[PDB]
Structures are given as C-alpha cells and as structure tokens.
Amino acid sequence: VLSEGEWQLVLHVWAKVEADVAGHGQDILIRLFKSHPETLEKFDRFKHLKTEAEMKASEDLKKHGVTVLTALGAILKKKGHHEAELKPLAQSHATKHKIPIKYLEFISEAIIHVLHSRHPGDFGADAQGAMNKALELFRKDIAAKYKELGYQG
Ligand code: HEM
C-alpha cells in the first residue's frame, strides 16, 4: 500500500508527463523494444520496425504510446483504487495480446528510465522509489487477475 506521501511523489512527476504524453510514450516504447526485443514481436502492428530511427518515425507507434500512458495515468490517479480500470486491461493483455507479467516488469523499467531522463528535478530517489512501488502495485494486481484466468505461469 503506498502512503499518501508516496502517492504525492508519483503524481507530481506524472503531471509533468502529462505535458508531453506523446513524447514520453515514444521514448518508453522505443526503450522497451530496444532493451527487450522479444516485446516488439508481440505487436504485429510494429514488428516491421527494424531500427530506432524507423521507430521514432512511426506515427502509429507514437499513437500507441499515448494510448498506453493515458491508461497508466488513469490508473495512477486512482491511487490504488483501480480495480475498474485494471480488469479490462488484464483481461486483454492475458487472453488476447498474450503478454507475460515479466514484460510488464520490462515496461516499468523503461517508464522509470524515461521519467529520470526527462524530469530529474522531480524524480530524485524518493520519487523513484515511490514510482517503483506504484508500478509494482500495478503488476501485483494484474498478476492476480492473470492467475485467476490461468495465465500466471
Ligand atoms: C503500462 C503497461 C501497459 C499499459 C497501461 C497498456 C495499455 C494498453 C491499452 C490501453 C491498449 C489498447 C486497449 C486494450 O487492448 O486493452 C493496449 C493494447 C496492446 N498492448 Fe498494452 N499496455 C501495457 C503494457 C504492454 C506490454 C508490456 C505489451 C507487449 C510487450 C503490450 C502489448 C499490447 C498489444 C500487443 C496491444 C494491442 C495493440 C494493437 O495491435 O492495437 N502492452 N495496451
């Protein structure tokens, strides 16, 4: 359970992301796909992209970055009371998109890296620990719905 102090750190940095959702979305997806190429293969939409420059040029990938960070932002702003927003996301990611929990760990690492690069004055170590705990809570609750459906592995 995050404390109120920790939620404040999280959402303070997140408000900064909200000034340039698309730029962040791009940088996060690019880092995820460069860091962990097996993730790119889960998107039939993007698996033609073979270089970072092609990724950076893809308007469709920038569109999807906005979709992902708008959904994450809505879950963060519920401060833990996010069951209505995770249900559908876990459902689709386990049964339709087939994303293992470990790749949710990978995208959390890429979110933390991009927020440290773009917002270092609002993302010192207190705020990095808090964002880590928020993203862990997201993964714990998606993992519990996976397990329900037979996809925790
Ligand atoms: C912060 C973590 C994530 C969030 C909030 C998120 C959010 C979303 C949303 C809102 C959609 C469209 C609605 C839906 O299908 O449920 C979506 C689609 C999808 N996501 Fe995620 N996602 C995350 C992590 C990932 C990861 C780590 C992968 C793959 C490694 C992935 C793969 C997919 C795929 C394949 C689609 C369908 C894209 C398409 O072909 O249109 N997601 N995601």
Side-chain angles (χ1 to χ4, degrees), residues 32-33 38-40 42-46 64 67-69 71-72 75 88-89 92-93 96-97 99-100 103-104 107 111 138:
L32 175 61
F33 291 157
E38 67 270 46
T39 62
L40 179 55
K42 295 290 176 172
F43 293 86
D44 282 347
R45 220 159 145 186
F46 297 131
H64 206 52
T67 294
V68 170
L69 294 191
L72 182 65
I75 283 159
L89 184 74
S92 71
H93 285 67
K96 179 164 213 177
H97 305 319
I99 303 309
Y103 289 15
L104 299 185
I107 196 176
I111 292 165
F138 168 76

Coordinates of all heavy atoms in Angstrom, one line a residue, residues 32-33 38-40 42-46 64 67-69 71-72 75 88-89 92-93 96-97 99-100 103-104 107 111 138, ligand 1:
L32 N 11.6 0.2 -24.5 CA 11.2 -1.2 -24.2 C 11.7 -2.1 -25.4 O 12.2 -3.2 -25.2 CB 9.7 -1.3 -24.1 CG 9.0 -2.6 -24.0 CD1 9.5 -3.3 -22.6 CD2 7.6 -2.5 -24.1
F33 N 11.4 -1.7 -26.6 CA 11.7 -2.5 -27.7 C 13.2 -2.8 -28.0 O 13.6 -3.9 -28.4 CB 11.1 -1.9 -29.0 CG 9.6 -1.8 -29.0 CD1 9.0 -0.9 -29.9 CD2 8.8 -2.7 -28.3 CE1 7.6 -0.8 -29.9 CE2 7.5 -2.6 -28.4 CZ 6.8 -1.7 -29.2
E38 N 12.2 -9.1 -27.6 CA 11.1 -10.0 -27.6 C 9.7 -9.3 -27.4 O 8.7 -9.8 -27.8 CB 11.2 -11.1 -26.4 CG 11.1 -10.5 -25.0 CD 12.4 -10.1 -24.5 OE1 13.3 -9.5 -25.2 OE2 12.7 -10.5 -23.4
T39 N 9.7 -8.0 -26.8 CA 8.5 -7.4 -26.7 C 7.9 -6.9 -28.0 O 6.7 -6.9 -28.1 CB 8.7 -6.3 -25.7 OG1 9.6 -5.3 -26.1 CG2 9.0 -6.8 -24.3
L40 N 8.8 -6.5 -28.9 CA 8.3 -6.0 -30.1 C 7.6 -7.0 -30.9 O 6.6 -6.7 -31.6 CB 9.6 -5.5 -30.9 CG 9.4 -4.9 -32.3 CD1 8.4 -3.8 -32.2 CD2 10.8 -4.6 -32.9
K42 N 5.5 -9.1 -30.0 CA 4.1 -9.2 -29.6 C 3.2 -8.2 -30.3 O 1.9 -8.3 -30.3 CB 3.9 -9.0 -28.1 CG 4.5 -10.0 -27.1 CD 3.7 -11.3 -27.3 CE 4.3 -12.5 -26.4 NZ 3.4 -13.6 -26.4
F43 N 3.8 -7.2 -31.0 CA 2.9 -6.3 -31.8 C 3.0 -6.6 -33.3 O 4.0 -6.1 -33.9 CB 3.4 -4.9 -31.6 CG 3.3 -4.3 -30.2 CD1 4.3 -4.5 -29.2 CD2 2.2 -3.5 -29.9 CE1 4.1 -4.0 -27.9 CE2 2.0 -3.0 -28.6 CZ 3.0 -3.2 -27.6
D44 N 2.0 -7.2 -33.8 CA 2.1 -7.3 -35.3 C 2.1 -6.0 -36.0 O 2.8 -5.9 -37.0 CB 0.8 -8.0 -35.7 CG 0.8 -9.5 -35.5 OD1 1.9 -10.1 -35.2 OD2 -0.3 -10.2 -35.7
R45 N 1.5 -5.0 -35.4 CA 1.4 -3.5 -35.8 C 2.9 -3.0 -36.0 O 3.1 -2.0 -36.8 CB 0.9 -2.7 -34.6 CG -0.1 -1.7 -34.8 CD -1.0 -1.3 -33.6 NE -1.2 0.2 -33.7 CZ -1.8 0.9 -32.8 NH1 -2.3 0.3 -31.6 NH2 -1.9 2.2 -32.9
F46 N 4.0 -3.5 -35.3 CA 5.2 -2.7 -35.2 C 6.3 -3.6 -35.5 O 7.5 -3.2 -35.6 CB 5.5 -2.2 -33.7 CG 4.5 -1.3 -33.3 CD1 3.8 -1.4 -32.0 CD2 4.0 -0.2 -34.1 CE1 2.8 -0.4 -31.6 CE2 3.1 0.7 -33.7 CZ 2.5 0.6 -32.4
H64 N 0.2 4.7 -30.2 CA 0.1 3.8 -29.2 C 0.7 4.1 -27.9 O 0.2 3.8 -26.8 CB 0.7 2.4 -29.7 CG -0.1 1.3 -28.9 ND1 -1.5 1.2 -28.9 CD2 0.4 0.3 -28.1 CE1 -1.8 0.2 -28.1 NE2 -0.7 -0.4 -27.6
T67 N -1.8 6.0 -26.1 CA -2.9 5.1 -25.5 C -2.4 4.4 -24.2 O -3.1 4.4 -23.3 CB -3.1 3.9 -26.6 OG1 -3.8 4.6 -27.7 CG2 -4.2 2.9 -26.0
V68 N -1.1 3.9 -24.3 CA -0.6 3.3 -23.1 C -0.5 4.3 -21.9 O -0.9 3.9 -20.8 CB 0.8 2.7 -23.4 CG1 1.5 2.2 -22.1 CG2 0.6 1.6 -24.5
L69 N 0.1 5.5 -22.1 CA 0.3 6.3 -21.0 C -1.0 7.0 -20.5 O -1.1 7.2 -19.3 CB 1.3 7.4 -21.3 CG 2.7 6.9 -21.6 CD1 3.6 8.1 -21.7 CD2 3.2 6.0 -20.5
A71 N -3.8 5.3 -20.3 CA -4.4 4.3 -19.5 C -3.5 4.2 -18.2 O -4.2 4.1 -17.1 CB -4.4 3.0 -20.2
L72 N -2.2 4.2 -18.2 CA -1.5 4.2 -17.0 C -1.8 5.4 -16.1 O -1.9 5.3 -14.9 CB -0.1 4.1 -17.4 CG 0.8 4.0 -16.1 CD1 0.6 2.7 -15.2 CD2 2.3 4.0 -16.6
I75 N -4.9 5.0 -14.1 CA -4.8 4.0 -13.0 C -4.0 4.7 -11.9 O -4.4 4.6 -10.7 CB -3.9 2.8 -13.5 CG1 -4.8 1.9 -14.4 CG2 -3.3 2.0 -12.4 CD1 -4.0 1.0 -15.4
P88 N -10.2 -4.6 -17.3 CA -10.2 -4.9 -18.7 C -8.8 -5.0 -19.3 O -8.6 -5.7 -20.3 CB -11.0 -3.7 -19.3 CG -11.0 -2.7 -18.2 CD -11.1 -3.4 -16.9
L89 N -7.9 -4.3 -18.7 CA -6.5 -4.3 -19.2 C -5.9 -5.7 -19.0 O -5.2 -6.3 -19.8 CB -5.8 -3.2 -18.5 CG -4.4 -3.0 -18.9 CD1 -4.5 -2.3 -20.2 CD2 -3.5 -2.1 -17.9
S92 N -7.5 -8.1 -21.5 CA -7.0 -8.2 -22.8 C -5.6 -8.6 -22.9 O -5.2 -9.3 -23.8 CB -7.3 -6.9 -23.5 OG -6.4 -5.9 -22.9
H93 N -4.7 -8.1 -22.0 CA -3.3 -8.5 -22.1 C -3.1 -10.0 -21.8 O -2.1 -10.5 -22.4 CB -2.5 -7.5 -21.2 CG -2.4 -6.2 -21.8 ND1 -3.5 -5.4 -22.0 CD2 -1.3 -5.6 -22.4 CE1 -3.1 -4.3 -22.6 NE2 -1.8 -4.3 -22.9
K96 N -5.9 -11.9 -24.9 CA -5.9 -11.6 -26.4 C -4.4 -11.2 -26.8 O -4.0 -11.8 -27.9 CB -6.7 -10.3 -26.6 CG -6.7 -9.9 -28.1 CD -7.9 -8.8 -28.5 CE -8.3 -9.1 -30.0 NZ -9.5 -8.3 -30.5
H97 N -3.8 -10.4 -26.1 CA -2.4 -9.9 -26.5 C -1.3 -10.9 -26.1 O -0.2 -10.9 -26.7 CB -2.1 -8.5 -26.0 CG -3.2 -7.5 -26.3 ND1 -3.8 -7.4 -27.5 CD2 -3.7 -6.5 -25.5 CE1 -4.7 -6.5 -27.4 NE2 -4.7 -5.9 -26.2
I99 N 0.5 -11.2 -23.1 CA 1.8 -10.5 -22.6 C 2.1 -11.1 -21.3 O 1.2 -11.0 -20.3 CB 1.4 -9.0 -22.5 CG1 0.8 -8.4 -23.8 CG2 2.6 -8.3 -21.9 CD1 1.8 -8.7 -25.0
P100 N 3.2 -11.7 -21.2 CA 3.6 -12.2 -19.8 C 3.8 -11.1 -18.8 O 4.2 -10.0 -19.2 CB 4.9 -13.0 -20.0 CG 5.1 -13.2 -21.5 CD 4.2 -12.1 -22.2
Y103 N 7.0 -9.1 -19.0 CA 7.2 -7.9 -19.9 C 6.5 -6.6 -19.3 O 6.9 -5.5 -19.7 CB 6.4 -8.2 -21.2 CG 6.9 -9.3 -22.1 CD1 7.9 -10.2 -21.7 CD2 6.4 -9.3 -23.4 CE1 8.3 -11.2 -22.6 CE2 6.8 -10.3 -24.2 CZ 7.8 -11.2 -23.8 OH 8.2 -12.2 -24.7
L104 N 5.6 -6.8 -18.3 CA 5.2 -5.6 -17.6 C 6.2 -5.1 -16.7 O 6.4 -3.9 -16.5 CB 3.9 -5.9 -16.8 CG 2.7 -6.3 -17.6 CD1 1.5 -6.4 -16.5 CD2 2.3 -5.4 -18.8
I107 N 8.4 -3.0 -19.1 CA 7.9 -1.7 -19.5 C 8.0 -0.8 -18.2 O 8.2 0.4 -18.4 CB 6.5 -1.8 -20.1 CG1 6.3 -0.4 -20.9 CG2 5.5 -1.9 -19.0 CD1 5.0 -0.4 -21.6
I111 N 9.6 2.9 -18.2 CA 8.9 4.1 -17.7 C 9.8 4.8 -16.7 O 10.1 6.0 -16.8 CB 7.6 3.7 -17.1 CG1 6.6 3.2 -18.1 CG2 7.0 5.0 -16.2 CD1 5.4 2.5 -17.5
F138 N 0.7 -2.1 -9.5 CA 0.0 -2.3 -10.8 C 0.3 -3.8 -11.3 O -0.6 -4.5 -11.6 CB 0.7 -1.3 -11.9 CG 0.4 -1.6 -13.3 CD1 -0.8 -1.2 -13.8 CD2 1.3 -2.1 -14.1 CE1 -1.1 -1.3 -15.2 CE2 1.0 -2.4 -15.4 CZ -0.3 -2.0 -16.0
Ligands
HEM1 C1 1.9 0.1 -18.5 C2 1.7 -1.1 -19.1 C3 0.6 -1.1 -20.2 C4 -0.5 -0.5 -20.4 C5 -1.2 0.6 -19.4 C6 -1.1 -0.9 -21.6 C7 -2.2 -0.4 -22.2 C8 -2.8 -0.8 -23.4 C9 -4.1 -0.4 -23.9 C10 -4.9 0.7 -23.2 C11 -4.3 -1.0 -25.1 C12 -5.5 -0.9 -26.0 C13 -6.7 -1.4 -25.2 C14 -6.6 -3.0 -25.0 O1 -6.3 -3.8 -25.9 O2 -6.7 -3.4 -23.8 C15 -3.2 -1.8 -25.2 C16 -3.0 -2.7 -26.4 C17 -2.0 -3.6 -26.6 N1 -0.9 -3.8 -25.8 FE1 -0.6 -2.9 -23.9 N2 -0.2 -1.9 -22.1 C18 0.8 -2.1 -21.3 C19 1.9 -3.0 -21.5 C20 2.1 -3.7 -22.6 C21 3.3 -4.6 -22.9 C22 4.4 -4.6 -21.9 C23 3.0 -5.2 -24.1 C24 3.9 -6.0 -25.0 C25 5.1 -6.3 -24.7 C26 1.7 -4.7 -24.6 C27 1.1 -5.1 -25.7 C28 -0.1 -4.7 -26.3 C29 -0.6 -5.1 -27.6 C30 0.0 -6.1 -28.4 C31 -1.8 -4.4 -27.8 C32 -2.7 -4.4 -29.0 C33 -2.0 -3.3 -29.9 C34 -2.7 -3.3 -31.3 O3 -2.3 -4.2 -32.1 O4 -3.5 -2.3 -31.5 N3 1.1 -3.9 -23.6 N4 -2.2 -1.7 -24.2

